[PDB]
Each structure stands twice: as structure tokens, then as C-alpha cells.
Ligand binder design. Structure first.
Ligand SMILES: [Cl-]
Ligand SMILES: [Cl-]
Ligand SMILES: [Cl-]
Ligand SMILES: [Cl-]
Lengths: 170, 170
């Protein structure tokens, strides 16, 4: 992952989020701060906030990152796709983790149904919101945000956009 | 423009629209058929319909074009960018037109304020909805939908997504 791609990964709430474009930010629902009247200084009424399970998207009225090109956001990826989870730590450390993605499904996690994609590491709770990306040609695609990990044994889950289709369970 | 890119350009209402991804379709507001209860066989309540001036986006619940990758949709492009307007005609003829893009502004056109970008051809009314695209590296970006042309003298306008910013007038 190049520096500019890492620059999209952004501290947010109790986790992280990701600038898909100058105005679009995605993150994991459970890290979104509660009881606030603005995000990044913008009043809530100036933001189109779309939340479905553990997937949250903000579309700001203001260009927040005019330095960035738009990039492609997809609903997960095909079985077996190798992605990178672009984890930043509070210290500043970068920890890109390779993951081989599995099935898209609605999965019960900590009492809630979560629409997401599981994968096997080839994480810590503070990492939630980190993007799952993969390279397509010379460009990068984002396809989920980090939502859960097993206590051991190398399974992770990213939340993905809402959407039903023939390749997903359901 | 490659065949797959052309394949996204789709007859719609009194004009055309464009598949940005398997679920996202953009078109020009004035070509959207009136008094219907579905688009492409999908009931309106199953679609997230976002309309701002002459820019209309549909996000379907069903994957309508699962053959397609997502591609980047931006709000217009920098001054001077050479785009291609991917015009299909009812006969099947392809007529890609080169255009050098100008200012993004809210412009009065036929009595209505239209948020769009003007450009100079380097069209017919039935062409409305055709995408304005430009190549970035090895990939293509869409940045507007055809909305208007001057009676002569080689000016065109594409509608663009809502959004204010330092490079646009307003
Ligand atoms: Cl690399
Ligand atoms: Cl920009
Ligand atoms: Cl070419
Ligand atoms: Cl697909």
C-alpha cells in the first residue's frame, strides 16, 4: 500500500475510518462516538449518514479531503481474494495484515447480526474501522471495514455495505 | 473507451444512463420517466433515489449488473480536463465526443438552475444522460451526465453530483 492510501486511514472515535473520496468516509458502526453534534467539525445535519449493521458511511457536504482522488468501494470481494487490512496503531505504527477472504454472510457476533465477510489471517479491538483493501491492476479497491476477530485461531471479519446477491449467503 | 465501458451506457427513459457499479446507475433528471412504479423491473421502494438538480442516482437493492466492477464517480473534473462523452444513438451507433471541460457552476438553463460543468466540444437532445468520462492511469473515471448543449457554437453541459468546494463557482 502506498503512502497516499495509508493517509486515508484516519483516527475516529474508539477506532479508525477511511476516506474513500474527498467527501465520503467509511467506518465500523461500533466505533462511532456517541452523543456528539458533529464529526470532523461538521454538524450532523450537513452529513448524509448511512448505517447498516456494522457498516457506516458519511457523505459530507464540505470537501474534507480535496487532496484525494475518489477510489472504488465494493461490497466485499470474491471468495479467496487476498486483501490487506491497513491497520494504524495509536503510536503511529503501520501494521498491514494479509488476509484471505471467505464468505459474505449475516453472522451473529456479540449478540448482534453483522452483515460482513470473514477471512483468515495469513489484530486488537482498537483496530476496528481499519479498511480491507486489495489491488486491482494499478489501483486499489476498498471492500470492508474491520469489525471483529476471534479470540484465537486467526479469523477476522470486515463489515461490508448492505446488499444481497447470488454470491453471498442469504 | 473499451467495450465494457460502453456496455455501462444504457437506454433509459427519454435518454440514457450509466452503470457506475452493479447497483449504482446515474442519469440526467429530465430524462427519468414520469408516472412509473419501477425502474428496470425494480419497485421504487427498493431503490435509494438521490436527485439534485439535473443529477439523478439510483442505488438498487438487487445487483443489476453483477458483471461490472465498481468505478469512480467524481463531482466534475479540473478546468481544462479533456473528457469523452460516451454517446449511444437509438440505432446503435457510438459517437464518442471529445470535450475540454470548463467551470463548475450553478447555471440557469431553460428556466431552471442546474449544478453542472460546461465544456467545449473539440449532440442531439436524445443524448441526455450520456456519461462524461476521462482516463486516469489505466482506468476510467465518470464525472457527469449530459444535460444541455447550445443551439450552436460548441458548448455542452454535464450535470454533476451536489457538492460545494473551493474550485467551483459558489
Ligand atoms: Cl505493494
Ligand atoms: Cl479534489
Ligand atoms: Cl482509447
Ligand atoms: Cl460483482
Amino acid at each position: 500500500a502506498p503512502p497516499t492510501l495509508w493517509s486515508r486511514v484516519t483516527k475516529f472515535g474508539s477506532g479508525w475510518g477511511f476516506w474513500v473520496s474527498p467527501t465520503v468516509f467509511i467506518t465500523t458502526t461500533h466505533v462511532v462516538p456517541t452523543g456528539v453534534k458533529e464529526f470532523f467539525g461538521e454538524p450532523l445535519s450537513s452529513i448524509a449518514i448511512h448505517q447498516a449493521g456494522e457498516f457506516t458511511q458519511f457523505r459530507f457536504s464540505k470537501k474534507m479531503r480535496p487532496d484525494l482522488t475518489g477510489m472504488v468501494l465494493e461490497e466485499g470481494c470474491p471468495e479467496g481474494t487476498v486483501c490487506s487490512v491497513l491497520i494504524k496503531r495509536d503510536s503511529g505504527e503501520l501494521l498491514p495484515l494479509a488476509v484471505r477472504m471467505g464468505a459474505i454472510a449475516s453472522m451473529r457476533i456479540q449478540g448482534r447480526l453483522v452483515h460482513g465477510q470473514s477471512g483468515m489471517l495469513l489484530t486488537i479491538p482498537g483496530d476496528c474501522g481499519a479498511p480491507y483493501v486489495h489491488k486491482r491492476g494499478n489501483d486499489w479497491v476498498v471492500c470492508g471495514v474491520h469489525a471483529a476477530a476471534t479470540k484465537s485461531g486467526n479469523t477476522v471479519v470486515c463489515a461490508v455495505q448492505a446488499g444481497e446477491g447470488e454470491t453471498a449467503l442469504e
